[PDB]
Subunit: 214 residues, 2 copies
């Protein structure tokens, strides 16, 4: 079933370039290993970057499941965000050597692979969604002026943290997981401060700036 032999191929490719490198991995090897003509392989994915898309997509959706447990017993913002970023890290863990090799492909600004490209759109909206979940259900006061962009800013933090995590050479990535924690604490205090009357000017400013930009 197309919808089903599709996920077969995504899977054989995902494991293939993990073992080999995105670069020296051909559609043809993927087809061969998959039991599927080269032409079929291209039918489900028009070349190698569309598999990465489907991998991002796949990773986003896995992330979104493992945060059931965390969103279930954390009420306040900080603990919500922090767990979600930790859960992210936990499921990225096995893909880390791949992310380091793959980094130089995805880090090409003008490549579809870049998480900021238009191809990656479906995966951004997806991931921002989680950041919608983290606050929309956080029993912690959040000013209206901010409610509309925090998602996006939090998502940005998360890309910061991905970048940092590719290059974190500490044991088991201790430091990244620290960064998520500090990042969440810092975000959370920003919002509390945001409630302070004297600097709604400032909160307006960043509301505007954040509604304009990619």
């Amino acid at each position: 079933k197309s919808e089903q032999t599709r996920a077969l191929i995504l899977e054989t490719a995902m494991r293939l370039f993990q073992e080999r490198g995105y670069d020296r991995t051909t559609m043809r090897a993927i087809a061969q290993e998959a039991g599927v003509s080269v032409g079929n392989a291209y039918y489900y994915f028009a070349g190698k970057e569309h598999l990465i898309q489907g991998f991002y997509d796949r990773i986003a959706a896995e992330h979104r499941a493992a945060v059931r447990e965390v969103l279930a017993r954390e009420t306040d913002l900080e603990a919500r965000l922090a767990g979600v970023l930790k859960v992210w890290l936990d499921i990225a863990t096995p893909y880390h050597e791949f992310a380091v090799q793959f980094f130089k492909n995805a880090a090409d600004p003008d490549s579809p692979l870049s998480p900021f490209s238009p191809e990656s759109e479906h995966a951004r909206v997806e991931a921002i969604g989680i950041h919608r979940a983290v606050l929309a259900g956080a029993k912690t006061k959040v000013p209206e002026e901010l409610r509309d962009i925090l998602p996006e800013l939090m998502w940005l933090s998360q890309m910061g943290l991905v970048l940092y995590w590719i290059f974190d050479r500490t044991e088991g990535r201790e430091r990244s997981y620290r960064l998520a924690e500090r990042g969440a604490r810092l975000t959370a205090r920003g919002v509390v401060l945001a409630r302070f009357r004297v600097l709604r000017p400032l909160v307006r400013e960043v509301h505007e700036l954040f509604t304009d930009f990619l």
Copy 2:
């Protein structure tokens, strides 16, 4: 001039190579043979690929620092000073965009001497931050004492925030970036003015602490 022209010749060649070959797979050897000098003669100016990048970073900081001379003489509003400075930075970076797009995957690594944040880039960094000090010093808006070091450094962080956006910007003149330097200069100059109140300063301290802990190159706590 043969000596200064060779200096620059090496530098431009190496950069074009890193840009098409990629930095990992360019050697001193290959650069020297592409410029058409002795490898000896190339090392004489740049002790290795890393010093070459530092050469790129230094050149560009000085350029920016020369170019800022007017804005920072005419403008007395902090915003407008920051505005101009950041904009002039864009004018100056503008030739190196395709370079930066290609070299971003090497310098992004904060554990690498290639990184702006590295102890190896100290010189270009201090010179760059020094510009944010003078943006501050000669602004009409006066500025808190306990924040006097952390602000120039946060402003330099934004600049890097801006460099990163610029790299990823695909719009025409990179005009979207020019619009960010302008809108970001606004938020920031409001940010500093507003840090005159005491409610805000801890968050300023704490943001400068997150960066100084997790990235090399900022002043200790």
